[PDB]
Amino acid sequence: SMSVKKPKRDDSKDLALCSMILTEMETHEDAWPFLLPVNLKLVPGYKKVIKKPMDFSTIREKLSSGQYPNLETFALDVRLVFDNCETFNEDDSDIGRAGHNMRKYFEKKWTDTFK
Numbered sequence: 001s002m003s004v005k006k007p008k009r010d011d012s013k014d015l016a017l018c019s020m021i022l023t024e025m026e027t028h029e030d031a032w033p034f035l036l037p038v039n040l041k042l043v044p045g046y047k048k049v050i051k052k053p054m055d056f057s058t059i060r061e062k063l064s065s066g067q068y069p070n071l072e073t074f075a076l077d078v079r080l081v082f083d084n085c086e087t088f089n090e091d092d093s094d095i096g097r098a099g100h101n102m103r104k105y106f107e108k109k110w111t112d113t114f115k
Contacts (some may be wrong), residue, residue, distance in 0.1 A: 010030040014071045021109050026056055034081055054080040078106055
């Protein structure tokens with residue numbers, strides 16, 4: 001509350017570390033469904049169904065341009081990528097599986113880096 005603060009968690013490396021995580025996600029072999037925005041002209045249904053499209057290139061631009069106020073907003077966009085993927089793809093598809101794998105991979109890096 002006013003003039004009463006919890007001790008200051010050092011957040012000065014968060015930017016760099018989210019960048020590193022993002023790089024590792026970008027370079028994973030199962031990243032391919034997620035590298036670019038889904039083409040909303042060419043994928044029937046996507047536009048109407050997926051209210052908040054997200055992909056790694058868009059996360060990378062937001063990161064590079066100071067559009068994440070903190071590391072939680074960054075993690076929310078990453079997760080959104082996988083949540084969207086699950087909404088639109090069968091678990092038993094290559095993309096569906098990619099998404100489960102990438103999420104698992106992300107969450108581990110996240111925990112190891114920050115928790």
